[model samples]
Target: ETAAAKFERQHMDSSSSSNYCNQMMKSRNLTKDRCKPVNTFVHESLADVQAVCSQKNVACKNGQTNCYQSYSTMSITDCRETGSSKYPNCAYKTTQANKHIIVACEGNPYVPVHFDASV
Candidate 1:
């Protein structure tokens, strides 16, 4: 569920548009009750995201050993909700960035399953 949720929320590609967040947030079932203020989508492949598990080991915010850091920079899109928007009218600002990402790995496969943060 965690991997799928992150993929749904943070997956990006050429198909992305100005209304990317608006569509994704709703379709991903994140806006059913209230607006999700901020979210990020990575424009890299699942293999690349998963490979972070073997890159640099890092300390997660919760002090867990599941965290890993990407050795290379990656393309990402940040979606931030607009302030003037109401519950049903969730607006967002889409901005792109290049940075090394942090993620959490789990299970025997040791794949990246959670987006911890980006640096």
Candidate 2:
């Protein structure tokens, strides 16, 4: 992208009118909900969601091999403490605006679990 285009994009993103209002509300003690769509919670560390399984680990309910991988996507919320014991590994993403990660875990003795590295 050209420098001019890049500057325009940054300007649009940074000068969004809604975001300005949201920032003002935040300064006034308004919670995240009051601010437009934004992430509030996030993972404490990357290790919180690392794969504990080996490459040859078998998939639950089948003999197929299991693999663990991390992915990212644009999201608007966090993936922690959703009233589940399965704690999430969370992390905030930079560069990719308003994006989060999808942590996929598969292995025997374990079911496929997913979490968003959001907020």
Candidate 3:
């Protein structure tokens, strides 16, 4: 209920507009009383992300063993803090790219549980 749901809540974006960060951060609850500082949105289908759970196995940056890396590059957007960012009024800079993503998986259905990174 948590890992899988939270991954989708924070990472998935079939597509996005220039206002992506502002909208996503708020809607996803990343910005509450403070700025999240940084986040990423993967412009891909949920199925593709779930499949990565069974792809290349790897260790997460923090030493978790449930992590895996995507087999191919995928389109994504990066949202980061502006120097003037503040709580409740947080702002971000958007950057787009195509890269392999890393994620951690768990549960009976075996799905992406976390958005580890992209490279």
Candidate 4:
């Protein structure tokens, strides 16, 4: 899949419930062989997330400079590993919040390729 498409599958969420992480992580193929340490899901449209690429330029965690931060706050869910979490049986702690988001962009069209953080 294209980076943008993969990003969409991994981060964007419209509807979410208590079991959000358990369901989404598995469906998104992130818990195949090992559990992802942490992840955040954005409750925003693909267009809205992509728009961040044109928002405020920001620093990325990895020392790259392609990242940008959203001017407006976004609804999101942060999923983290639980002690019982293990490969093929991944479990997570889910927390939801509203915050400004950071994303790294790339490509000719300049779309978000990675979710940086939410502040």
Candidate 5:
């Protein structure tokens, strides 16, 4: 099996970058790594991120190969101007690739979200 596949098997819960980092530190008994702080990054898998962002009325940008699949730009101006007609107060968007996707949002009705797929 591939290294990634084997790693995943050993660390079943280490799907996200943050989780993977945690696992690596724990396994190595690492106290620190250079000047890099042990910070956790919240992230989700591409497809679920795309679906949720789309459902949230966020915009959608598509791409196949990039570190970050897509970018979403939103504004409260939409909600302010629309005044709950389409409920434009908040927005989100998705950028999708084969195994990677990303979603982002902004505005008063704020939401922070991410997703992942077990492979």
Candidate 6:
């Protein structure tokens, strides 16, 4: 799996709360080289996210045809690293939101491979 794909599989979970991002960012190796400034972790089933591929189609930033938008709102946590933080000492603010998500899907299973953003 790709970095984004691995991120989703390892970090996606509805049970997560405010502390979710701080730990996941490091554990998932996103903070290994440098802190990822911003990221979104979807708290829905892989199947649900993957199903978006068959929903409303939208153009992604890269203009890829693989981009998809979810038909329903999903729970997600937006992680933004603290401004005062430095690499290896990264801290984050985790904010939860319910919104429609856009994802990029690929591979044989055709599952969500990247979190485009939440709207």
Report the number of the highest-TM-score candidate: 4
Q: After superposition, how far is residue 71 of candidate 3 from its true place, in Å?
A: 0.7
Backbone clashes in model 4, listed as residue pairs: none
Give residue 9's error in model 3 in angstroms.
0.6
lDDT by residue for model 3 (17-108), tens: 67778878898888986798889999899998889999999999999899999999999999998998777798888888999999989899
Model 5 misplacement above 4 A: 1-19, 22-45, 57-102, 105-119
TM-score of 2: 0.20
Report how far residue 29 has shifted in candidate 3, in Å. 1.4
Error in Å for residue 98 of model 3: 0.4
Per-candidate clash tally: 1, 1, 0, 0, 5, 0
Off by over 4 Å in 1: 2-16
By descending lDDT, how would the candidates be arranged? Answer: 4, 3, 6, 1, 2, 5
Stronger candidate by lDDT (1 vs 2): 1
lDDT of each: 0.78, 0.30, 0.88, 0.91, 0.28, 0.79
Deviation (Å) of 46 in candidate 3 = 0.3
- Write one digit per residue (lDDT tens) for candidate 6, span 2-35: 7556846544764456787898788777888888
Residue 88 CA error for candidate 4 (Å)? 1.3
> Can you tell me which runs of candidate 6 are displaced by over 4 Å?
2-7, 14-16
Q: Mind giving the per-residue lDDT tens digits that candidate 2 earns over 7-87? A: 222122221222442333234232333322223322223232342222223233333334333343332222112222221
True lDDT of residue 35, candidate 5: 20
Superior by TM-score: candidate 3 or candidate 5: 3
Q: Which ten residues in a row have the lowest lDDT in candidate 1?
A: 7-16
Candidate 3 Cα outliers beyond 4 Å, as residue runs? none
RMSD of 1: 2.3
